[PDB]
Amino acid sequence: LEDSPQTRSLLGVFEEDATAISNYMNQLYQAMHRIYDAQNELSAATHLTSKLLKEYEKQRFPEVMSSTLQQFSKVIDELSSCHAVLSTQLADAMMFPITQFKERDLKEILTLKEVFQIASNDHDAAINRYSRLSKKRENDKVKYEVTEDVYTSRKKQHQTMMHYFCALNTLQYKKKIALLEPLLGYMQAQISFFKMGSENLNEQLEEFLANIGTSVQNVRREMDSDIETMQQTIEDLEVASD
Amino acid sequence: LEDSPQTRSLLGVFEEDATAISNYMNQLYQAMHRIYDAQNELSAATHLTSKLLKEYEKQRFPEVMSSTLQQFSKVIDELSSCHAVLSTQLADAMMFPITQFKERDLKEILTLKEVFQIASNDHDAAINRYSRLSKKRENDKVKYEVTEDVYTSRKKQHQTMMHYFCALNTLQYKKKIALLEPLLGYMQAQISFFKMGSENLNEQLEEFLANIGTSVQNVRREMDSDIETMQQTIEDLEVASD
């Protein structure tokens, strides 16, 4: 780039790219924010369920079950902590860099864009005033002033243009960084989550769950048997009640 | 149980237990429903993020990045499917049995409770009418009728009492079943989720992510270097613009 016309032309293309960048990255921000919120809500719900299972012993019903519930509550508490760790990492390694891109970087672009537009308006006004004053008989003073304002407004325009162009050039790098960092952060958090979660979901736990399954089928069978007893008891009491 | 007084006394204790049961199981229903909703929202958000990454190639910016994004989108698509499978299993193996306990079983208890209360009101009315008619000179007809209504209202009362007591007895079993089944269903779904998820988060993926990390530090360095160039370009153009 050697001059303002080539620079201004390239500025415009960079500004159009920044537009497409903003749109896509805003959509990515939003999708990621949904992952973030859902994962925080899941951590909280998982933890609350474990907490409720611990409270079973505190219910007063006018031991085997309390122990089974304690064992479930321990495993769930472990899973809840995997979810909580993931949530935390997701905030820091995924949400932060995508939020910083939208709230700091895309914002800087808009700000510098409008500073440049006003500088531009101002120079346009100086050029208009020069045109107005060119059409009349005048003294040196206002003629010197109006020329001078053209020079100083153009310089202001060029300087603000360059601040804007620098940020738009830098945006080309920031875009790449802000795409890859949060995806890397997300994947790294997930590897830890799945490995830690998988590692305590073991063969002992499988034995435990197999035994629960058997205890459930047992209760069902005892239930059906006792329903027959109650039906007999009902017939007896019908007789005895008259 | 041999007679109505012992039965009615025991009915009352079973009814008090059913109350404590309803309260706790309603709290469990609610906690589990939150896990359910959060996990469905997480599946959807994860899938949408992968879908957006696939759309990058379709953005028009006035190749290396598109390939990196495709590789991320594939791994995330795999994780999204783990989440979707879990969601489905959670509906069927956790939500259903706890919902059925609240919507079918606790509802049956309330229904049979009120049928018995009305039968009870009705017999109370028959006893009251007998009392009223005991106090006057009357013919056989209304005296036979009022005695007869006492017998038939008591029988109705006893029958509705026994339907209620049967369901309350059955509830003692259903409570155990409805606690253990959804916890078993939840844990079994999670074992599959963590194992399937963990198993494709491999050493090849670690290599990929390590390379991303390096590509990010590279972009940052290129950025800082190019910012220096742009600052020099800016100084040059300031001169050339006047």
Side-chain angles (χ1 to χ4, degrees):
Chain A
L1 300 163
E2 305 113 33
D3 59 24
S4 337
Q6 287 166 42
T7 308
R8 212 166 155 192
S9 177
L10 202 60
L11 185 85
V13 177
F14 274 71
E15 171 177 86
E16 297 187 313
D17 202 50
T19 291
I21 293 169
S22 179
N23 288 353
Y24 187 72
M25 299 294 284
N26 269 284
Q27 288 188 103
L28 224 216
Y29 174 81
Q30 292 165 23
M32 275 176 182
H33 202 285
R34 285 179 58 187
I35 291 183
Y36 184 55
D37 286 340
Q39 180 60 45
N40 298 158
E41 177 47 9
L42 191 54
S43 304
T46 306
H47 178 74
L48 181 262
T49 301
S50 172
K51 181 192 225 210
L52 247 181
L53 298 172
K54 284 185 213 306
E55 287 185 335
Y56 173 91
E57 35 167 14
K58 264 103 88 161
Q59 314 296 302
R60 298 220 98 284
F61 304 109
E63 215 171 87
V64 197
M65 184 56 74
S66 266
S67 162
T68 296
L69 291 194
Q70 189 52 60
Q71 281 187 252
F72 263 118
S73 83
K74 200 186 160 176
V75 194
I76 302 166
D77 189 38
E78 288 158 9
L79 301 175
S80 174
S81 76
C82 291
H83 285 285
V85 170
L86 181 55
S87 277
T88 299
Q89 287 207 67
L90 282 197
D92 310 341
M94 171 187 83
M95 273 317 314
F96 164 61
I98 195 57
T99 298
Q100 176 170 250
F101 185 78
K102 165 208 179 30
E103 306 298 344
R104 180 201 59 192
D105 304 315
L106 297 186
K107 175 182 192 283
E108 185 187 27
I109 294 308
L110 289 190
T111 307
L112 292 173
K113 181 203 215 322
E114 279 308 298
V115 163
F116 165 62
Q117 181 71 54
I118 293 167
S120 290
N121 293 350
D122 281 350
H123 175 64
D124 286 350
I127 293 298
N128 255 48
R129 191 166 182 234
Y130 186 90
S131 171
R132 170 191 302 146
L133 306 185
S134 78
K135 305 204 195 305
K136 43 178 276 69
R137 174 183 154 261
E138 260 294 2
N139 79 332
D140 288 337
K141 203 191 91 184
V142 132
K143 291 189 294 196
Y144 264 82
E145 178 188 342
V146 163
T147 301
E148 140 218 299
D149 290 344
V150 169
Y151 295 162
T152 64
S153 71
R154 186 50 252 235
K155 183 169 186 99
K156 187 164 193 218
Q157 188 183 276
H158 187 81
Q159 286 168 321
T160 60
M161 185 180 67
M162 292 325 275
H163 291 310
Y164 184 34
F165 188 92
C166 195
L168 283 162
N169 182 63
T170 295
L171 196 77
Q172 291 292 320
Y173 299 92
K174 287 190 170 188
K175 170 204 176 177
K176 290 183 189 188
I177 294 172
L179 263 165
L180 303 174
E181 278 190 341
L183 297 171
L184 168 64
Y186 174 85
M187 290 299 319
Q188 290 176 181
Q190 291 297 333
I191 285 162
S192 285
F193 166 78
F194 282 100
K195 302 289 172 189
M196 185 74 84
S198 185
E199 254 94 306
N200 57 51
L201 301 185
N202 54 26
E203 197 62 34
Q204 197 160 165
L205 171 69
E206 303 266 19
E207 198 201 350
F208 169 85
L209 297 184
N211 283 179
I212 299 321
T214 290
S215 305
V216 163
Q217 290 319 294
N218 286 352
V219 173
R220 289 189 174 280
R221 279 186 200 100
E222 300 182 332
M223 184 186 75
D224 292 350
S225 183
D226 195 36
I227 290 174
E228 302 185 312
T229 297
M230 182 63 61
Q231 291 149 46
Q232 189 58 69
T233 297
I234 285 174
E235 299 181 3
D236 295 353
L237 293 158
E238 247 225 335
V239 178
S241 75
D242 166 355
Chain B
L1 300 163
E2 305 113 33
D3 59 24
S4 337
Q6 287 166 42
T7 308
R8 212 166 155 192
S9 177
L10 202 60
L11 185 85
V13 177
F14 274 71
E15 171 177 86
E16 297 187 313
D17 202 50
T19 291
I21 293 169
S22 179
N23 288 353
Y24 187 72
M25 299 294 284
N26 269 284
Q27 288 188 103
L28 224 216
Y29 174 81
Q30 292 165 23
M32 275 176 182
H33 202 285
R34 285 179 58 187
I35 291 183
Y36 184 55
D37 286 340
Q39 180 60 45
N40 298 158
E41 177 47 9
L42 191 54
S43 304
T46 306
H47 178 74
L48 181 262
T49 301
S50 172
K51 181 192 225 210
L52 247 181
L53 298 172
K54 284 185 213 306
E55 287 185 335
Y56 173 91
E57 35 167 14
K58 264 103 88 161
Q59 314 296 302
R60 298 220 98 284
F61 304 109
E63 215 171 87
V64 197
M65 184 56 74
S66 266
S67 162
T68 296
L69 291 194
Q70 189 52 60
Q71 281 187 252
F72 263 118
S73 83
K74 200 186 160 176
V75 194
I76 302 166
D77 189 38
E78 288 158 9
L79 301 175
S80 174
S81 76
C82 291
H83 285 285
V85 170
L86 181 55
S87 277
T88 299
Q89 287 207 67
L90 282 197
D92 310 341
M94 171 187 83
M95 273 317 314
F96 164 61
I98 195 57
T99 298
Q100 176 170 250
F101 185 78
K102 165 208 179 30
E103 306 298 344
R104 180 201 59 192
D105 304 315
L106 297 186
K107 175 182 192 283
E108 185 187 27
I109 294 308
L110 289 190
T111 307
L112 292 173
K113 181 203 215 322
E114 279 308 298
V115 163
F116 165 62
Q117 181 71 54
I118 293 167
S120 290
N121 293 350
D122 281 350
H123 175 64
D124 286 350
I127 293 298
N128 255 48
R129 191 166 182 234
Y130 186 90
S131 171
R132 170 191 302 146
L133 306 185
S134 78
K135 305 204 195 305
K136 43 178 276 69
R137 174 183 154 261
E138 260 294 2
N139 79 332
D140 288 337
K141 203 191 91 184
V142 132
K143 291 189 294 196
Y144 264 82
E145 178 188 342
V146 163
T147 301
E148 140 218 299
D149 290 344
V150 169
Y151 295 162
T152 64
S153 71
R154 186 50 252 235
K155 183 169 186 99
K156 187 164 193 218
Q157 188 183 276
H158 187 81
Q159 286 168 321
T160 60
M161 185 180 67
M162 292 325 275
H163 291 310
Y164 184 34
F165 188 92
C166 195
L168 283 162
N169 182 63
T170 295
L171 196 77
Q172 291 292 320
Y173 299 92
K174 287 190 170 188
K175 170 204 176 177
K176 290 183 189 188
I177 294 172
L179 263 165
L180 303 174
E181 278 190 341
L183 297 171
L184 168 64
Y186 174 85
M187 290 299 319
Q188 290 176 181
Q190 291 297 333
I191 285 162
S192 285
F193 166 78
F194 282 100
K195 302 289 172 189
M196 185 74 84
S198 185
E199 254 94 306
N200 57 51
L201 301 185
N202 54 26
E203 197 62 34
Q204 197 160 165
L205 171 69
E206 303 266 19
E207 198 201 350
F208 169 85
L209 297 184
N211 283 179
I212 299 321
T214 290
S215 305
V216 163
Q217 290 319 294
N218 286 352
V219 173
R220 289 189 174 280
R221 279 186 200 100
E222 300 182 332
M223 184 186 75
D224 292 350
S225 183
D226 195 36
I227 290 174
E228 302 185 312
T229 297
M230 182 63 61
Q231 291 149 46
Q232 189 58 69
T233 297
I234 285 174
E235 299 181 3
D236 295 353
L237 293 158
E238 247 225 335
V239 178
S241 75
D242 166 355

